[model samples]
Target chain A: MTTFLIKHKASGKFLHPYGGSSNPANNTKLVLHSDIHERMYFQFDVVDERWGYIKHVASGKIVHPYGGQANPPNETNMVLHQDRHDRALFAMDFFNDNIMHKGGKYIHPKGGSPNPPNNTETVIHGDKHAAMEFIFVSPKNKDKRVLVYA
Target chain B: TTFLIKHKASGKFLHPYGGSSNPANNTKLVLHSDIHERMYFQFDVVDERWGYIKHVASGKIVHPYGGQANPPNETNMVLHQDRHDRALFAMDFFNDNIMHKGGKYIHPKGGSPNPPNNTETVIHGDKHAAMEFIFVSPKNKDKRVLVYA
Candidate 1:
């Protein structure tokens, strides 16, 4: 189980689908928050240097594409689900420490226009929003992890 | 009484002036301003908790940047029409009450993630406005009293 903390590059917060509370349901958008807890951790099982599936800890859910099962619309970012399949598959592209998750539609969180760069949850639709970029940090030994290795 | 939003850090006025009536228009919110507009603003009563502000220059809809003025230093965008979410606020928090819905705030980090304050160096809502600026008018009605951070 390759466990790590998923953080948003601009916000300094972790990928908390439901935030401070634990659960893998709706009524929330994919957002970043500063506090670290069990919910912030995820288990990554890679198929290659750039592809894999991430399972959320608290809800046992996984990072997934939201719009139904086919030709998902644009701007429809990812959500949490309990199953694993093609939609849950992800391609990891790294630019220094920033990890870009290229998902189901060659889309990620639209980044450029992100305002208050803080606790605001962002939508992953197209690759426009640079805010889609994230940094993968390992808990306990965050420093031991590398950019090729943070 | 009245207010003159003297930035606790810089001790200047939150001058509401800039951003020509164009898309590329960018008004730099500064701490020092002798040249002013309806910079003097008032916090109209939206209900009690959340209300939009009004500037003589801009009316009740004081525009902030995209993302509901929640992103840090998003310099206010010039409006062509009235949009909801764009002007939602939660004032009366006292101190320097920067309002933002969905939890984002007009934080007080001062410098942007890009710093030096340009259009590219936008706003963010990470932490509290650490004794900085959310600058409203001195005294919206003309007590020359500015709102504070």
Candidate 2:
């Protein structure tokens, strides 16, 4: 069994391994497996508010998960699990509103006032509340592993 | 996971994807998908010549999923997709064709001698080919991953 551990850059803490939308971005370090297992566990941690839009590279389409809502206001974490397949895609929104409460301040620091649009909503304060994690399970082998957030 | 079925006759290679001709007839329509994620599907055509090609693009909405107040009416414009994969197909045929040089043929219905002045060189050596038809993933714009045959 191969176990991989991912750490948050801001905080030197090991993310929790669970399946939920709280840890958006689904940031999880893969834990490779040498043999098939029956079930797998995946997990991550979310301490701040993150939100933003996603643009498809091929079509040039922009998608706002929160319906184009302003940052620091609407933040969420999403985990999309394809039951039949072992692979999954995770997403999380780290925004000013969430990060500010996580013991850190936004780049602009001013709330309510419209600031320059930053592509990413996820934000972290000095070595503390800025990180995430994720885990995936293998349907065939039940193989589980952890994927770290970058 | 959705697709559009285009008749072979109506299916023309839009430059970077492969060929340089429009589908001779609407009988040969292309099975286009509005979703942006990577997926796989199979066609029921007997011959390999009658298969569908995948033309992936980001931010391009081909058609509406359920329906919309402003339904898209363009034939070759890029479609936009929402988080739910609902198609926000906008009808900007004239502008889209202008941007991609789709009206360069010489026929009355499908032919117009008008050509693009700034023709960019594509992978193939075809000088008259329209390069803008090639769709690149908007998410990875810096990568400029060209979708082609």
Candidate 3:
């Protein structure tokens, strides 16, 4: 179980939960943040060679596309779901540097190709745009830290 | 201690009343006849002042709907994040472990003092059987660490 910070290649921001919660509520949308927030840590539970469940390091919840298996409209929000079903499963495409859903859609950032600003929403689409490419960067410090909230 | 709560009167364990892996907001915590891992819960007390009751299965804290809602009777007690004071509970006594918020007590609805199986839990203004509960150790307890600050 290797931990990773899923970063949008163009914006260089990390993929994160909107509310900054470890155990985020169902339907919590995904966002991109510049700072290294604790909620950014994700664990890849590899069931297959290239595909696996992308689980939040703290909550163990799966990252699920809004509409599972169906044709989720472009700009449909990506949310974290409680269930670990076929819709929640994803594959890491190293060749294309993109994370692909089982139904053939890619994790597409809001502003395709160009650098998107922080706090932009991430979505799922079937386009081969460069905005779909993301890089998994390993954390320099793997030690667990306490959550500091105001 | 890691355990499941059993209403002393009904002999039913407190459970998350739903089929979703992540119980939704306002999802009632009900009384169930059978025992499973989802029924297990743990206490996380902050500074010994605010007590947070977390559902072991979903890692969600128990809180009353809308934090402070009207008509305490039959107010849905559900699982949610620990954000406001409503989610914070206080024990009647260190030993009693009777959970209460403000003047409302955490007990099953329509059961008055003695509740039946599958009855949803609520925060109501009742004293009878309010303090009657048994925290029994479960068959298996997961070692997942939950933080409440």
Candidate 4:
């Protein structure tokens, strides 16, 4: 198993489910620069020819939009579940270098934007939200002795 | 849980531990020029942290080497009741664009050329293999892609 970290080039931080002190609970805002939780470590499982299931490493659950009970855009930020559905499929937005540029943010295209896509509010599809894009960081700092994804 | 890994370069399909009528068990994987049922793979749950790889055709699972095993490599073999040590692994990608330069190969150092450590024979070498693949636009005519990231 390769241990790779996911990063957001825009925010220069790791994509964590929330800031802290939460159960990675449903609908929590997906934030940046948050401390690494077990949820931060992800396992990418192939779902189809081109899609992969991004499961939370700690929970074994996929990132499910909180839309199961109600409207997704206004549903919980995003929850983890042991089930698979259209929401769990992460389509790779291959920008360059064959990287998973926008890997895990699963969105619904027909919906509207909540805000600037920084905190809890993300653009929604007719049924879901916009997919988030991320970078895979590998460069290590010589002096800091730290390996960061961003 | 089932999926296909088609090569972006050669257009060959990665035969998941099987494909041959005889059933390729505990051996190196080859790039099958054509696609078929054997190429379909099911990654069942090993835990919340890992995956259990199973070839749709062979019914065998990918198990790590434990020295006493016959091939001593990461070989596809019969599963135990619990299917221990058969879990596959992967890392997370946030908004980053992680690259595997050679396309099919993932190296420990994140560069290209498919090092032996990144090869199948030396499975689970010092560094992990960062599998890099490219996907085209979505074309699900009937199925809803409302949730596709």
Question: Which candidate leads the pack in lDDT?
Answer: 3
Q: Chain A only: list TM-scores of all candidates.
A: 0.72, 0.22, 0.85, 0.55
lDDT at residue B113 of model 1 (Cα atoms): 28
Worst ten in a row by lDDT for model 3 chain B: B140-149
Per-residue lDDT of model 4, residues A1-150, tens digit only: 233345544344454555443345555544444245445665567655446665556656565555543244433344455677766565433232122212232442112332224343322233322234445443231112112111
Position A41, candidate 4: lDDT: 62
Estimate the TM-score for candidate 4.
Answer: 0.37
Q: How many clashes does each candidate structure show, in the order listed?
A: 36, 78, 0, 31
Q: What is each predicted model's overall lDDT from 0 to 1?
A: 0.48, 0.23, 0.68, 0.39
lDDT tens digits by residue: candidate 3, A1-150: 456778777677778898689789888888887878667888777654345688888777878888665556666778888887777778755435678887777888775745777777889888886777777666653222211111
Residue A72, candidate 3: C-alpha displacement in angstroms: 3.2
- Clashes counted in candidate 2 amount to 78
lDDT of 1 by residue, A1-150 (tens): 446777665555677775555785743456666777877777765643345576676677777667535455666666777776765666444333343344444433344433334455545454434555566667765433322210
TM of chain B, each: 0.55, 0.20, 0.79, 0.49
Chain B TM for prediction 3? 0.79
The most accurate candidate by TM-score is: 3
Candidate 4 ranges beyond 4 A from true positions? A19-23, A68-77, A96-132, A138-150, B1-149
* Cα lDDT, model 1, residue A6: 74
iRMSD in angstroms, per model: 21.6, 18.8, 18.8, 11.5
Runs with alpha carbons beyond 4 Å of true place in candidate 1: A26-28, A47-49, A68-71, A95-119, A128-130, A141-150, B1-149
TM-score of chain B of 1: 0.55
Worst 10 residues of 4 chain A by lDDT: A141-150
TM-score ranking from best candidate downward: 3, 1, 4, 2
lDDT of 1 at B104: 48
